[PDB]
Amino acid sequence: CGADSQGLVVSFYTPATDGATFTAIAQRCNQQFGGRFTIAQVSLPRSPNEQRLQLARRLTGNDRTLDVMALDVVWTAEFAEAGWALPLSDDPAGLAENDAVADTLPGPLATAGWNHKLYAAPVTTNTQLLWYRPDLVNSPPTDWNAMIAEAARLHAAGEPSWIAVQANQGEGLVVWFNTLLVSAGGSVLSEDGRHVTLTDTPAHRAATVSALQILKSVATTPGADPSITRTEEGSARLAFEQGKAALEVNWPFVFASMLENAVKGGVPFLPLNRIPQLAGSINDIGTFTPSDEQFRIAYDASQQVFGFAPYPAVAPGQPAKVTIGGLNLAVAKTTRHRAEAFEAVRCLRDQHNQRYVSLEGGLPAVRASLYSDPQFQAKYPMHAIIRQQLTDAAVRPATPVYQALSIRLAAVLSPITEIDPESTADELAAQAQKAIDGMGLLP
Amino acid sequence: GARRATYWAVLDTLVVGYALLPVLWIFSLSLKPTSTVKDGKLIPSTVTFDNYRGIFRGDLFSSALINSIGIGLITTVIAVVLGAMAAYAVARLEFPGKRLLIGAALLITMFPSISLVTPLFNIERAIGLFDTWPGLILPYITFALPLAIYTLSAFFREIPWDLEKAAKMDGATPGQAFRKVIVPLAAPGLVTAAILVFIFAWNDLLLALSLTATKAAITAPVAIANFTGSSQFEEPTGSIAAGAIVITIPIIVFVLIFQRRIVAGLTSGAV
Amino acid sequence: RMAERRLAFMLVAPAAMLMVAVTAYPIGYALWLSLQRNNLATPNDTAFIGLGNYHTILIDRYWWTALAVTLAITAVSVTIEFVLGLALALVMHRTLIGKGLVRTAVLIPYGIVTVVASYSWYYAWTPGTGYLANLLPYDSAPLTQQIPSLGIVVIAEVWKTTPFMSLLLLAGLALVPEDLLRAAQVDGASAWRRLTKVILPMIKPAIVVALLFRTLDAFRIFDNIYVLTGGSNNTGSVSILGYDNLFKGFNVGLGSAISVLIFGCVAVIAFIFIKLFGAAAPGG
Amino acid sequence: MAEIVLDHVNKSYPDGHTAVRDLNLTIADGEFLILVGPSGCGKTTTLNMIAGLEDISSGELRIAGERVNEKAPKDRDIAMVFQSYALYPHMTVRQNIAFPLTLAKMRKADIAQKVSETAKILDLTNLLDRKPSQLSGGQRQRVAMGRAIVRHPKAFLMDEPLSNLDAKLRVQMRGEIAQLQRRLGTTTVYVTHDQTEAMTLGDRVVVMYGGIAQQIGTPEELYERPANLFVAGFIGSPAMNFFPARLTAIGLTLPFGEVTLAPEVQGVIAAHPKPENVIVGVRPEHIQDAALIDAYQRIRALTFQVKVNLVESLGADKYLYFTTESPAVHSVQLDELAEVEGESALHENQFVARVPAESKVAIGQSVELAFDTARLAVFDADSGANLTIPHRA
Amino acid sequence: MAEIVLDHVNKSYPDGHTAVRDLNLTIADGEFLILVGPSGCGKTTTLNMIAGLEDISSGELRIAGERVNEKAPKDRDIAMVFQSYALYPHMTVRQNIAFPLTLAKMRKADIAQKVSETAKILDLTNLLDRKPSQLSGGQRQRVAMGRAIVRHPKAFLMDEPLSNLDAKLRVQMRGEIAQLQRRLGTTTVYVTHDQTEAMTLGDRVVVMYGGIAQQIGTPEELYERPANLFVAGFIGSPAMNFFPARLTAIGLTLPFGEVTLAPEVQGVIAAHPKPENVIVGVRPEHIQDAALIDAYQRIRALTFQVKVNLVESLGADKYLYFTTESPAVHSVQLDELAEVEGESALHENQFVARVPAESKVAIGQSVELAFDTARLAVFDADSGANLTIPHRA
Numbered sequence A: 001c002g003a004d005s006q007g008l009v010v011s012f013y014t015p016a017t018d019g020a021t022f023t024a025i026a027q028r029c030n031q032q033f034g035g036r037f038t039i040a041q042v043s044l045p046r047s048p049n050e051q052r053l054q055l056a057r058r059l060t061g062n063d064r065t066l067d068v069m070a071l072d073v074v075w076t077a078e079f080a081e082a083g084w085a086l087p088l089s090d091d092p093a094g095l096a097e098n099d100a101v102a103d104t105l106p107g108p109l110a111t112a113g114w115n116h117k118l119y120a121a122p123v124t125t126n127t128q129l130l131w132y133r134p135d136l137v138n139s140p141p142t143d144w145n146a147m148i149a150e151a152a153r154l155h156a157a158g159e160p161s162w163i164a165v166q167a168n169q170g171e172g173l174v175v176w177f178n179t180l181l182v183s184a185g186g187s188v189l190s191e192d193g194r195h196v197t198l199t200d201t202p203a204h205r206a207a208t209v210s211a212l213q214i215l216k217s218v219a220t221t222p223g224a225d226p227s228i229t230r231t232e233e234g235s236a237r238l239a240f241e242q243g244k245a246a247l248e249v250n251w252p253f254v255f256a257s258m259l260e261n262a263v264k265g266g267v268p269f270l271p272l273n274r275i276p277q278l279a280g281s282i283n284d285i286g287t288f289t290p291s292d293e294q295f296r297i298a299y300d301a302s303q304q305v306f307g308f309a310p311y312p313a314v315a316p317g318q319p320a321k322v323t324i325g326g327l328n329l330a331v332a333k334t335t336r337h338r339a340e341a342f343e344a345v346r347c348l349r350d351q352h353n354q355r356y357v358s359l360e361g362g363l364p365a366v367r368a369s370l371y372s373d374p375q376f377q378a379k380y381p382m383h384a385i386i387r388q389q390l391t392d393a394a395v396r397p398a399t400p401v402y403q404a405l406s407i408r409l410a411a412v413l414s415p416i417t418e419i420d421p422e423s424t425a426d427e428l429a430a431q432a433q434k435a436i437d438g439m440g441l442l443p
Numbered sequence B: 001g002a003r004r005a006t007y008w009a010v011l012d013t014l015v016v017g018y019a020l021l022p023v024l025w026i027f028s029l030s031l032k033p034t035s036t037v038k039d040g041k042l043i044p045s046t047v048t049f050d051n052y053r054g055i056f057r058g059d060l061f062s063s064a065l066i067n068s069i070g071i072g073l074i075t076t077v078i079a080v081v082l083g084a085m086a087a088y089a090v091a092r093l094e095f096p097g098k099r100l101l102i103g104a105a106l107l108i109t110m111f112p113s114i115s116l117v118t119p120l121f122n123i124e125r126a127i128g129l130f131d132t133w134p135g136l137i138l139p140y141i142t143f144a145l146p147l148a149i150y151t152l153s154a155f156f157r158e159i160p161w162d163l164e165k166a167a168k169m170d171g172a173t174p175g176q177a178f179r180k181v182i183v184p185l186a187a188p189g190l191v192t193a194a195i196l197v198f199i200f201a202w203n204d205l206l207l208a209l210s211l212t213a214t215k216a217a218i219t220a221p222v223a224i225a226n227f228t229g230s231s232q233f234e235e236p237t238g239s240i241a242a243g244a245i246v247i248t249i250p251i252i253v254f255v256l257i258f259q260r261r262i263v264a265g266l267t268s269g270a271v
Numbered sequence C: 001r002m003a004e005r006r007l008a009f010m011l012v013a014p015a016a017m018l019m020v021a022v023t024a025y026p027i028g029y030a031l032w033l034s035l036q037r038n039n040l041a042t043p044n045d046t047a048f049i050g051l052g053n054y055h056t057i058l059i060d061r062y063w064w065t066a067l068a069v070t071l072a073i074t075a076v077s078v079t080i081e082f083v084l085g086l087a088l089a090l091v092m093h094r095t096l097i098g099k100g101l102v103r104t105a106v107l108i109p110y111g112i113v114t115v116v117a118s119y120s121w122y123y124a125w126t127p128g129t130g131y132l133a134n135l136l137p138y139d140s141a142p143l144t145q146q147i148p149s150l151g152i153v154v155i156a157e158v159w160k161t162t163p164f165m166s167l168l169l170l171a172g173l174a175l176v177p178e179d180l181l182r183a184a185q186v187d188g189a190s191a192w193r194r195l196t197k198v199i200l201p202m203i204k205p206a207i208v209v210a211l212l213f214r215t216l217d218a219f220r221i222f223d224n225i226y227v228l229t230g231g232s233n234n235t236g237s238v239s240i241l242g243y244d245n246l247f248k249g250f251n252v253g254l255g256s257a258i259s260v261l262i263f264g265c266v267a268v269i270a271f272i273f274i275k276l277f278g279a280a281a282p283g284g
Numbered sequence D, E: 001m002a003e004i005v006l007d008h009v010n011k012s013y014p015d016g017h018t019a020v021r022d023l024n025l026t027i028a029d030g031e032f033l034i035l036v037g038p039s040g041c042g043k044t045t046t047l048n049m050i051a052g053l054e055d056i057s058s059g060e061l062r063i064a065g066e067r068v069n070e071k072a073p074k075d076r077d078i079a080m081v082f083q084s085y086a087l088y089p090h091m092t093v094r095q096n097i098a099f100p101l102t103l104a105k106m107r108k109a110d111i112a113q114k115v116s117e118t119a120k121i122l123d124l125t126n127l128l129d130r131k132p133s134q135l136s137g138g139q140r141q142r143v144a145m146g147r148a149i150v151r152h153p154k155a156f157l158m159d160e161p162l163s164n165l166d167a168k169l170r171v172q173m174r175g176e177i178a179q180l181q182r183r184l185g186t187t188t189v190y191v192t193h194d195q196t197e198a199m200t201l202g203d204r205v206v207v208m209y210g211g212i213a214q215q216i217g218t219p220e221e222l223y224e225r226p227a228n229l230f231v232a233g234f235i236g237s238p239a240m241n242f243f244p245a246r247l248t249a250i251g252l253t254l255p256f257g258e259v260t261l262a263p264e265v266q267g268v269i270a271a272h273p274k275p276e277n278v279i280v281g282v283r284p285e286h287i288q289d290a291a292l293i294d295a296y297q298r299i300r301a302l303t304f305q306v307k308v309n310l311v312e313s314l315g316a317d318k319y320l321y322f323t324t325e326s327p328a329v330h331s332v333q334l335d336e337l338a339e340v341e342g343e344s345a346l347h348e349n350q351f352v353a354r355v356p357a358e359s360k361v362a363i364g365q366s367v368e369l370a371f372d373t374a375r376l377a378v379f380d381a382d383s384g385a386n387l388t389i390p391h392r393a
């Protein structure tokens, strides 16, 4: 004691929403390295709009401990220009610029390259689904107007009648508004961020007005969530699992949470504790970890008080265009072990750790090969819907000034209940213009 | 005996309730099992120490309590040392500009901490002490040293200075007087100003939140501000409550131990 | 005389030197940064602007909204804190059965961490699990509306910072000799004319000093707003404004102008309290 | 203004300290009655029980039959002067005096008129607009008295308002207080610790001790007839020289010869329970050098010889402590009167004689003196009362 | 213990204010010399100068023959007692008084022994372990005495040690002080202001005024023969009764006739340049009631009547306040003292008659005054000095 000397410790920075899974990933990865070094996971805040704050504070403050960061899927176009998140092209081993594109899906990979040069390696991806209680509702809506109709129908019968959407002033609201706008045939910025294309075309104005009208029609309806304007991912997932809601729109990571939290107690409408076949089926640290058939038991049991369905469209004719999201792994510029970091990155994302994160953390893997395995398809039932939704997904503007634009958007849509479509649509344009020109001061 | 007794009893139980309700509330939250934690029961039912178990399993709060305590001590030591050598000079000497000095020592104490974080960040990112103990001790003196000067200047003016001439009249060596008669008359003032400055060190969040990055320099209020719960899928209310209780009990028992000195110090001389 | 002169000029030399180097230097640095287009994302290219960083603030809107919110919070919370602190110092001074007990009770909120209290108040107003939220008419959720959230913040601020003000007031109170209270009682003090006629005009300096502390400390409110609401929905004080425009916008050139304006306005507050109302130091 | 009735009023604590035990006395209208006694003997306790600031244990106090045990001090219409001057520093002396009038909701013009009147009674015209800091101790005391007089209350309750000033200011303001009270003719209950104050002013004096008013009488009456030994040792300055002796059918066995007594005083001392030892007291003004007095005094005086150890020029008279042939006095109650000062009985066997400064007898020179024998203060062995007065009932 | 000879010590205040003027006096050994006077008259000033706390511009002073105009207070070996009692709260009683011994580098054993002995001198061995706070103020004075006695210095400076005590306490304690000083034969300077302590303990009482030593010597010389009006007024209980008069070479022209005295006094008056106005002084103790004493001694006295305003009953003596139709006592030396009293011109020329108890003069009645012819002194209102004593350059 007194002087605990050890090898290098590559510091890994992942959001807290999925800390306990990337911790086990790091544990599995600290075996294929022997004694060369070790990886240590460190948690970032749970909200996307402040994960960037922490990362940028550490990067600009020359924090020499920041080694590997799992950054959001919309920040590359900014961290690359700002000098941070050094490009894949200069790994002293010369392996990342081709390990990244080996088996990655074609969608998420397009979010890393900024000027055709890659600056990060995709580690996971996301897309929202529709989760419902099949015992209460039947034939899930598959349309937003149908969603609200079913909500009113359940409220008339004195039932859980919340819709459980993400509506805070964060990025989860801009994501939803972007999904609606693009699925209605619109877009915030031009193909290249140069001038706001929100409300210049009459068709574009109609699209943004329809999106705003859907946003306002939700959150102002009988039996709605009272604190709807303070909800995000965790809050929506929890408010659904309690039994307060019968519908929700949330990322796929809610299925593993459902199963694990039901086995650990919690969920009242699915006991799963009085089944001695599930005894000892909780790891000593909390995770679920079924054996091989405990999963079948606890999944066939939940298959009748839980279910999912593709994202609800806007008009009943055309399908939806769900906004893509995920995490990319990048190596910070304030790193002295700029080789071990690039080694640990490619050792973090491989055909076993991807399988592990997707089968015990809900996070959709990005290795395009995994979605063709039978067993993985049998322990990840929403794989087909995820693959389908990822095909025609609607990406975000991807400009260097994006995160300064999403703040303006979320600020002018901050209270959803206090929305009126015609003025708010014309008001979004001025704020988007200011964000493009970087004028004024953000809230 | 009859009226006044019950009068004061029912009057001063109200303040006990006032002070203890926002604490008993969170403490009861901290014991509710993760299932029943969502009902508005003020009194729990079938309490479980599982939240505290999950808090103790881990190392996030030890390595932050230690940082807070160490930074507090290293700050208050130099604060008291550099503040006594001024308070003694402000309560006994008449240099030109005394009222200005005491006014400054009064005002800068409640400095707007937001006016500092921009230049301090822009300086410490470029000198090298971004996430370090000195990088925090250096801004903290802006609030420690004025408070120490104020407190010790208030206390020193209550010293029977005539004892100086007394010792000069029955002894010798004004240095020996300064060493043997006023130093025992000035030790408790230092012992109390130390407690005051130390307690005052804890209530900062903006600077410790915007100038610290990792486990090497994160304090307690920053550690609890970024906490989210032991597990990643369970309801975080009970876990956050237990973490808060655990992170706040030490300074609470410290204040309870030193209550007498604290009330004698803040109320300068009185009580 | 020269002896004590050159003694003071050497005893208050390190104190003043350190205070200058650690306070007046960052302020001047902020003032010099407040004139440039200094951005964190693009460090190498910073150009001397002029006054183009105060124009874009004084003409903006989020600035005035935050200033107004801060002033309202400060005024209301300080008034309520003064009333409660006086009513509490009285009890702590004239109690009869247990005084150590009431003193301990009052100190408990004083030494508590200013964030766990905000967590307590945050979970008290959450519907379903908040024993306060379960009293309002169903489907209230007051943490979403602006004014109810400001009210909750004020409640938390009062509960946290009463004990300090009550002790400050009991300081100036314990120097009121009880014989004066007895003489007033004999002459016909109604136990209210007593207070408003002898006790308050006698402790005016302590009152004004406590007011100065509480005003300058509530003007920098950051923590309860950061925890309870986070500044979203226009309930963000003037500190949240700078903390966001520095770390989310990376704009140092105006994140520093905000600090300069905050310094100027707290200096105006200090000038008011000092010139008018006296607010002299206790040393006299 | 109105007589103050006492119905077995007492002060006893549940913590054990009993301050008063069932006192009954009526304060005559206009009389300058004064309370005197040692520290903590119940004086301030009685005064604050009157003022209602102190809770009454039991009994009933009546202002001519008015229920005031439950009455609020603001609703008793009383006034008082606190020795701490009880002054309000923030308000000027004019506002100080006007304060109780302000509480009286009287007309501000007539309020200022009354203030001007009462201040001109005290000659404080240029001080009313000043602050107490800008005034002298005598001026502050005058301010306090003026604040107490303007109310025209049922009675005044003064509390040694001249205790903490110079002696000359003390005596002149004492005369002035006598003049002001007599001119005003209102009931005043003066409380103090010194006997001379009462002796110079009191229309009547009441000695207090531990809740027992040992006597209720006039200053001259306390001077001529100490009702007991405690009053003899406490009232008078200095106390009368004390001598021990045993009972004699014709007088007492003085250490300087046989003292004979008149038949009437012999009868009255016989009427008291016969003591084993008697305590004899003679005042220093009685004991005088026999070298200057006529023989007509010596027929009743017992002359004797005595040497002196203490000599001083004390102005017109000389208080002369002498090495005398007189042992220490012993009595069951004299012990509680001994340890008052600390240097007790160290100058015993050496008593003082108030003699004119004309004589030049210095230390070592034994001078033959004589004093009247009937001027003795006699005390019982157990009761210690003046046996020249028969035991009352 | 060692002689203390003053020689024309002079000041230079930064303000130039004159606090001292050519002080010359040998403070002899074994004596108890007392400096008495009002505020700012220099007692504390010259006492600090004795302690060397205040520095001179010019002048000389020697203790044991050696110059001490520059010697440090730590060096002169003099013990001073402070009115603030100058007690160190962090030291126990025995430690508090041993402190100077430990400072003087003595032996732990003999230090503790001498502490025990000096405590026995003050009977403080009963509470040698306590702290200064938890004992009474008189006991604090006793601890001051303990610190004084131990070091055995060359002189004592007991500055107003009885300021905070009570009357009886202070008289017995100053008797103790005088007898202890005699026991130790130490040269003391009892800087006080009260005349009782001044004249009952002083071997050479020195009075001060604005930096002028009016009269220096035994209390009896000043008492019978006041050098001028300042000592005549500041000394006396009450002061000498002043009667203005008109100049006469065969007597003095009083507002009520001529007083027939011996002519050599008039010759002494004529020895000086003739003054314009004169005042006549007679102490209250010299005036008696002619209704009790015949005109035997009054055959040469100038007799007249005065209107009595107040009467005082003292017991052994009687006091009457009486105002006559004589001009107000106005003098240049009395006008400098006019700023002291506060209640001016109400009872000007109202004097008191120190008469025994048998005098029963009624109030308000105009009665003649009986007093010895020669007990009055002649002092002119112009120079203020007593013309009864010749002007010696």
Ligand SMILES: OC[C@H]1O[C@H](O[C@H]2O[C@H](CO)[C@@H](O)[C@H](O)[C@H]2O)[C@H](O)[C@@H](O)[C@@H]1O
Pocket: A015, A016, A017, A018, A046, A047, A048, A072, A073, A126, A171, A172, A173, A175, A233, A251, A252, A253, A324, A325, A326, A327
């Ligand atoms: O699936 C769990 C993740 O959800 C959040 O991230 C998603 O939501 C963000 C905005 O609401 C998107 O920007 C992001 O692309 C999505 O992945 C959460 O921020 C993550 O920490 C969770 O891992």
